[PDB]
Amino acid sequence: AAPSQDTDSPLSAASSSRNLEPHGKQPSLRAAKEHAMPKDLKKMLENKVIETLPGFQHVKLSVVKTILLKENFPYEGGLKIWECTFDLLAYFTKAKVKFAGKKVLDLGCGSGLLGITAFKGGSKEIHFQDYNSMVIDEVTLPNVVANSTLEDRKPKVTQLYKCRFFSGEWSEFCKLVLSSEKLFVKYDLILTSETIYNPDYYSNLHQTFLRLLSKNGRVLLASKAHYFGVGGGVHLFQKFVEERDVFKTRILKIIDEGLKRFIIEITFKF
Amino acid sequence: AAPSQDTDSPLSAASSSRNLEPHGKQPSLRAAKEHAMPKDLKKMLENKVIETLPGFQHVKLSVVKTILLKENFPYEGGLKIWECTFDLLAYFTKAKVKFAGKKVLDLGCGSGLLGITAFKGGSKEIHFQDYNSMVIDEVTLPNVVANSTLEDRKPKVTQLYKCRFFSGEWSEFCKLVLSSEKLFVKYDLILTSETIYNPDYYSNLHQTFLRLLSKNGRVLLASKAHYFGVGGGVHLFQKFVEERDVFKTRILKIIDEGLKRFIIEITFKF
Ligand SMILES: C[S@@+](CC[C@H](N)C(=O)[O-])C[C@H]1O[C@@H](n2cnc3c(N)ncnc32)[C@H](O)[C@@H]1O
Ligand SMILES: C[S@@+](CC[C@H](N)C(=O)[O-])C[C@H]1O[C@@H](n2cnc3c(N)ncnc32)[C@H](O)[C@@H]1O
């Protein structure tokens, strides 16, 4: 079997992440879960490798890698980070996106670099959501912790309470998170990278924006133009939003290399 | 045991790469080896993940990753790439370093991104050297191949003969490579990243430059200011070069973040 290249979707056989994404004719109808921050913070990072993310078109970010032997050869392993994440990171710095004091959601966070940027940026509350439970425990939580002062700009260890972590399908996450405060406060910003690859979940995603976004807030969404096979894309999604007539969209940036990538802004009409 | 951070040297216990680097009181006195390009090119990449290197302060480069399960959770694994590699990549683009027609050596190549840049840049001959045999077979060779047109700017498959691959200690590599042509042609460029961390091998490295560098060529060396424990660094190395009085050095760029990093040019006096 051929190697996965950039142009394989999150659901292709070749993709490392296939089994961390909802798929099939009857996926989990399990409820969503909030994940607590472990008591022992140093233990989440034991034996890991903390690596600076290279490139100067973003803030200083760290990523946690795991040493994994194969035929006694040491690999540094991490969860795949999709291209559009870096586009959105670059766009935060270039467009001087303001994070201080905001309530922020990283929807479909994977490694959590978007939320972590907001965290380091002075956001009051940062929520992270991934579909997969293990992604949150094994990757997201450790990554956030590694971007605190624990070891060692970086927020002190005592600010970690500002971050909260959720797993499950968007419908479930929505119901759960709406019940998690005496009176729910909407997000000022929802940041999301590569979450419109699958048209089967556009209904759920739209409904999530409708229930969770503040009146005056916005979604910053990064996406490839099209995803082959699974069949989602930017045009298709804008059509979907346009038909429902609740939000407006606006293309903030095109990244032009080979197949195009987009950063898109979604706000309420209004 | 605490996680390895940027400020651990290549020989620290925490470092993933410790056993791929020469160390101890009696390392291998084995001869160096040239490694042939395998016959079956597609098979070198089977089941791998080909990932674009993010950041736009370098040319488009691809990196081969391996899917490695742990508790049934899929990691994308790769050999560690040291920070200074990216500094030197940025410096190639910023300073418009000219590669076309040159004979180039990537000394201590690891993943081989420096040599690959030269390859994509039109160099006539590109030699890759790592200490470790497995590094070359498992990482370097596949990385070069992944940056050819095989799958599918990128050089066609038919240009791969221009790349040659070597493993072993620098003294041995030198003797070997000097015997590998009816009349050896010196390198116009030697590119090297993080190879002066260990003062025990400064003699060997200097001798390698002396025997292998063209009269009118140059070494472009990227290094951290200092490496703790093992104890090498930029000042210490410039002293060493200065004492032997064969080469001159010149600092081309400082990258100023926390502890400093340098790009250094070495030429003959003449
Ligand atoms: C391809 S990944 C991108 C991950 C990360 N944002 C990045 O760019 O590297 C897709 C993300 O969307 C999430 N996701 C996809 N469909 C979902 C759904 N129906 N409900 C909840 N989360 C979903 C996945 O868990 C994952 O975080
Ligand atoms: C820390 S790594 C850097 C690898 C790669 N250049 C990078 O920046 O990611 C050190 C490199 O120097 C090589 N090396 C170190 N000492 C050596 C020696 N005495 N002889 C030959 N190679 C050596 C290693 O094999 C490796 O390629």
Report the alpha-carbon distance of residue B270 to residue B268 in Å, rounded: 6
Do the annotations mark residue B172 as ligand-binding? no
- Sheet with A163-167, side-by-side order of all strands: A33-35, A163-167, A125-130, A103-107, A187-193, A213-224, A261-268, A247-255
End-to-end CA distance of chain A: 51
**What is the experimental method?**
X-ray
Q: Whose CA is closest to A164, among A118, A206, A196?
A: A118
Please say whether the dihedral angle defined by the alpha carbons of residues A92, A94, A95 and A100, taken in this order, is positive or negative: positive
Both tokens of residue A165?
């972590």
Q: Tell me the residue type at B232.
A: G
As a whole number of Å, the CA-based R_g of chain B is 18
Please say whether the dihedral angle defined by the alpha carbons of residues A66, A68, A74 and A79, taken in this order, is positive or negative: negative
Do the annotations mark residue B51 as ligand-binding? no
Report the alpha-carbon distance of residue B99 to residue B116 in Å, rounded: 11
CB contact under 8 A, A78 and B73: no
Number of domains forming the structure of chain A:
1
Residue spans of alpha helices (H) in B8-140: 41-45, 83-94, 113-120, 133-134
Q: How far is CA A120 from CA A58, A64, A145, A149, A222, in A?
A: 12, 16, 11, 11, 20
Report the alpha-carbon distance of residue B122 to residue A52 in Å, rounded: 31
CB contact under 8 A, B46 and A134: no
Report the alpha-carbon distance of residue B140 to residue B159 in Å, rounded: 16
H helix or E strand, kind and range, residue B46:
none
HSE value, Cβ hemisphere, 13 Å, CA-based, for B172:
17
Please say whether the beta carbons of B113 and B53 come within 8 A: yes
Question: If you ran DSSP here, which 8-state letter would residue A165 be given?
Answer: E
Both tokens of residue A19?
């089994």
Report the alpha-carbon distance of residue A212 to residue B95 in Å, rounded: 48
Please say whether the beta carbons of B92 and B264 come within 8 A: no
φ, ψ for residue B197 (rounded to 5)? -70, -25
Query: In a 3-state reduction of DSSP, which class is residue A203?
Result: helix
Tell me whether strands A125-130 and A163-167 are parallel, antiparallel or unpaired: parallel
Report the alpha-carbon distance of residue A38 to residue A163 in Å, rounded: 12
H helix or E strand, kind and range, residue A157:
none
Strand partners, B164: B127
Q: Measured between beta carbons, which residues in chain A are less than 8 angstroms from residue B20?
A: 74
Both tokens of residue B168?
């072993």
Both tokens of residue B149?
């047109």
Q: How far is CA B198 from CA A172, B11, B225, in A?
A: 55, 9, 12
Q: Whose CA is closest to A153, among A198, A119, A189?
A: A119
H helix or E strand, kind and range, residue B130:
strand B125-130
Query: In a 3-state reduction of DSSP, which class is residue A228?
Result: coil
Q: Write out the binding residues of A for S-adenosyl-L-methionine.
A: 81-85, 108, 129-131, 168-170, 193
Report the alpha-carbon distance of residue A141 to residue A80 in Å, rounded: 16
Both tokens of residue A76?
């540094």
The total of other beta-carbon atoms located within 10 Å of residue A190's CB is 25
Q: How far is CA A51 from CA A78, A143, B81, B85, in A?
A: 11, 10, 10, 14
Question: If you ran DSSP here, which 8-state letter would residue A196 be given?
Answer: -
Please say whether the beta carbons of B80 and B108 come within 8 A: no
Quick one: angle between helices B83-94 and B113-120, nearest 10? Answer: 20
C-alpha B188 chain-centroid distance: 16
Report the alpha-carbon distance of residue A220 to residue A189 in Å, rounded: 7
Best residue among B21, B85, B169 to mutate for probing ligand 2, ranked by most atoms within 8 Å of CB? B21
Residue given tokens 């910053």 in the structure block: A220
Whether ligand 2 lies within 6 angstroms of the CB of B84 is answered as yes
CB contact under 8 A, A68 and B55: no
Both tokens of residue B98?
């000219």
Report the alpha-carbon distance of residue A192 to residue B187 in Å, rounded: 48
Strand partners, B128: B106, B165
- Sheet with B62-70, side-by-side order of all strands: A48-52, A62-70, A73-78, B73-78, B62-70, B48-52
HSE value, Cβ hemisphere, 13 Å, CA-based, for A182:
0
H helix or E strand, kind and range, residue A92:
helix A83-94
Tell me whether strands A62-70 and A213-224 are parallel, antiparallel or unpaired: unpaired
HSE value, Cβ hemisphere, 13 Å, CA-based, for A224:
19
Please say whether the beta carbons of A58 and A192 come within 8 A: no
Residue given tokens 């430059």 in the structure block: B209
Q: How far is CA B145 from CA A2, A70, B126, B135, B155, in A?
A: 14, 21, 13, 14, 10
Q: Which residues contact A59 (CB under 8 A, 6 or more apart)?
A: A89, A92, A93, A117, A120, A121, A153
Residue given tokens 């990932």 in the structure block: B51
Nearest-CA residue for ligand 2 atom 3 is: B194
User: By residue range, what is the domain housing residue B150?
Assistant: 1-270
Q: Which residues contact A132 (CB under 8 A, 6 or more apart)?
A: A20, A21, A167
Q: Whose CA is closest to A262, among A229, A230, A235?
A: A235
Resolution, given in Å to one decimal, reads 2.4
Taking each continuous run of H as one helix and of E as one strand, the counts in chain B are 8, 11
φ, ψ for residue B163 (rounded to 5)? -100, 135
Residue given tokens 């084995």 in the structure block: B30
Residue given tokens 């210490």 in the structure block: B236
Please say whether the beta carbons of A68 and A96 come within 8 A: no
Please say whether the beta carbons of B189 and B181 come within 8 A: no
